[PDB]
Write a protein that binds this ligand. Sequence first.
Ligand SMILES: [Ca+2]
Lengths: 808, 156, 145
Amino acid sequence: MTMDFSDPDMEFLCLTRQKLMEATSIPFDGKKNCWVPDPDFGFVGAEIQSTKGDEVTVKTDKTQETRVVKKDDIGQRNPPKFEMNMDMANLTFLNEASILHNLRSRYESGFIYTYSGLFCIAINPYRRLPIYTQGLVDKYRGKRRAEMPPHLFSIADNAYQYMLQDRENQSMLITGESGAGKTENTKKVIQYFALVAASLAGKGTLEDQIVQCNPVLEAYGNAKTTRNNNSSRFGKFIRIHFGTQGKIAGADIETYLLEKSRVTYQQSAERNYHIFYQLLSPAFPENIEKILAVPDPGLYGFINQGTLTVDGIDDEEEMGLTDTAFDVLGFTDEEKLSMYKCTGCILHLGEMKWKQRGEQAEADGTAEAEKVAFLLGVNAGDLLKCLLKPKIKVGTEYVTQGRNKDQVTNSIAALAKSLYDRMFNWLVRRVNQTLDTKAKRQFFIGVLDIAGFEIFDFNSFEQLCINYTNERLQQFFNHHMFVLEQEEYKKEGIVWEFIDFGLDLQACIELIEKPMGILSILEEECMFPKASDTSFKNKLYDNHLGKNPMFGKPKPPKAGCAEAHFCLHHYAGSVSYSIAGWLDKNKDPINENVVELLQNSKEPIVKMLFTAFQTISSVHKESLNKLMKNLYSTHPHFVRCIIPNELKTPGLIDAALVLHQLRCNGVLEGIRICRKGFPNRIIYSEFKQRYSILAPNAVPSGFADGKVVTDKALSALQLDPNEYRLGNTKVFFKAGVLGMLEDMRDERLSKIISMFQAHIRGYLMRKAYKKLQDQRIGLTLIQRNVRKWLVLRNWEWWRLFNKVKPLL
Amino acid sequence: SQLTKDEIEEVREVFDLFDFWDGRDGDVDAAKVGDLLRCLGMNPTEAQVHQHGGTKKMGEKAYKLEEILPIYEEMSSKDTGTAADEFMEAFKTFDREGQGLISSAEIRNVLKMLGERITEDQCNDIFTFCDIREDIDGNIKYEDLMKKVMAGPFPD
Amino acid sequence: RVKLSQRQMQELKEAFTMIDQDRDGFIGMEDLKDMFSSLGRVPPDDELNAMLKECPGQLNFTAFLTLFGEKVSGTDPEDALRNAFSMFDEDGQGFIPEDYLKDLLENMGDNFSKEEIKNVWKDAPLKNKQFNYNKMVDIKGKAED
Ligand SMILES: [Ca+2]
């Protein structure tokens, strides 16, 4: 917590002192409290009862059920001082269970923002919160992270400081799905960089000018994936620019990896891009006819492969905002036609049928042909000619007509894809022009949106394709951590014993790229006519089975439960792939003649197509390759958005769901690397204020150096020197160190309290001592004066001078 | 190894006091081994007393002077009797603002609700005894309390 | 022992003196029987002798003090007792609560016998089931009720 825990704004970011102190002192016993696996809420807090062999018995604490969990299932829970902890990096127990807690509990306390290493986690609250005030903005204006509580502006501001400071472009990678508000965030991050540009001292806002175009792109770049109603099947990098004075000076958008395949293939419960379906709705009939189509989506093999519509989606309305947005970016209702038409043209290329004589394919119609022939602005005859039988060279020109039916079918698909691609590239170019209302750019802070790691029940060439990417991104991350930490130690003169962290993922990655790699193999196996799915598997098995730990093999599931063919080990765990149609999907050959031929008529068309026979992988490789060269050039910043529950409802937390996100996030991968090192670090002074109690000494807490005490405190507790190292300003600890120290403090304190109590009784009683003494004298005097009296009450004489004197 | 003659005489003199008050008969009740020991100047913890022969109710076991000595002696082997040091760090755990001031409410809370509990009575008394006041909300100087306590009801 | 102070030995001089008038100082049979005349309380022959038996024979004043050896043994001074009881009266006089004295004589300190106890309760200055020390101390020496 930072600044004033009581300042009104910080209600959803800090945690009022009184509320903290309170939450920080709750009941605890590091000897028996614990994290334990729970079938309904992932992991739950518990108390251990007894032990025997590899079978521990325990008691939960909310539904106090006695369960018999195993030993490598008892998660050591973090002692209180870590509750509502702000940076999970600080937890002393960095286990899954624990990472869940700190996040959940904070979300269940209204807090969304949490740091976990370089990561800035953010969970969707599902409700407007104050959090983004231009008053708060100043609060975070120039403060280094540590100075303010979590929050997204910190990450974005520093991001800024670094720009002007180190003088090198900055990137912001945010992850998260659908209801992660990933969008909002990026929006708000754009807003921020804005407010700060004019915050030095003297036709639409940035945010809007950009959020303005997001609909057109979504129309061509998104769609429904098995597990997501609206999935951008491309990677967008929104670069925001600045001038020497940290001045905003413009923007522009780069795009990577558009899922081509999708234009001609659908996975049962998925869908081709949204724009296809939109066009075919009761909104702009005229076009439906300009396009040469009937508002019946299902009547086109390039669209019906999957589903028709999605739940909670009113196509029309979208076809609406889309057309409306097309004018905000404001471009010719004619271009707007061409764009559409092109789109539609894709609808007929899937219709064109074919047949063959011996081994030479010919048309099975001519309507579709002319339909595409026209929509494009070329002559059908020639097209079919160059489609069914083209002519090339050597010096002379032979009829490369080798063509057959299986070759055209593929061929036509290709065209569509390419059409769809050039199109998209274009669409973007134009929005950039919308944006280039600039002067002069020097630096930038981009924000990367990219499909996150995927794992479905049925994983195919598509899935590998994304993981491959993501896996190259986690490496991007791990590398970063590596460099930095390496600095973080040198700064504290600690010895560095670690090979670059990214290297940990090189394995898998290599098992993908390198010659004789998964993809490469796939490629070669594509140039062979009679190559079959089996002929591919074998070659993979041949080349890698026992030979590489990363490549493995699954085992037949149910009956319908798809057959798997091999699995790889991704930072996100172990994914199992099915080879099914890879041979098919991967073929994306270019048909030259079609280009040159396609270099005629209709303005755009010329332009588009106016800028061997390869595959998709080769391509995927090229883009990724580029995207990265782009990333590694920038100083990164990672935001992790997170869905808390499947049912858009505040305060709730779906364990499994969150966890899953965390593994794909990398959040868990960071902690993994964090683990192998000395995660916990303490300024001597902080260490002093906390454990002196453990090895107190006569020197006034005021003239005592931190290093020493800290030092001397450990020597005293005889701590395996292997668990910690003494820095120039902090003391680095390993997993669970502090956890012990904390519990020994609690231990010591109580003893030490029984003692003060002891010295109290010592004064209390030692004070009676004197009394008891005096009163000995008394009981004696009486006790004995009474006796001598009992003898005398009957001693004749005694009586006498007891008479003889009052008579003197 | 063992105690010294004078050391014995001392254990003794105290011993007599105690057996006296319960009937000069060479026996001191166990229920008083704690108190005995304290009058010797030691400050044993209850666990320390039981682990050394002490019993709670009065009519269970008796001890002769020859039996207490070794006890007193053993009892003395321990050295974590506690230093001002330990009491400070300890108290500090509760110093909300690091001035050396604790809400009287809390210290007592500690002394009562925590550790080997102390009686409501016992708290008042000690506080009245070491003459430790609380200001408006310029409460109790814990160091004060500490020193005084470790100082003995009979200073000079 | 010698605790037979001057306050005690003189207090005993003026006692043996009056009795005297015996052939130059000697508490002799007559000195005694005579005495019991102004004493307002009868005399007996045997007993009057059983009193001489005490000292060897012939009681001057010297022997008179020696015969009073048993009397010094515990006789702690006057007030000493008063204060001694004081210590057990936290309430402004009217003094010590009966119970206390019991558990205080019977089972505390140099224990009293249940027989030594009764001997005490017969004469005892009581009321409100409470005790009276200054009246008891009074008895100790004696000046009557
Ligand atoms: Ca006794």
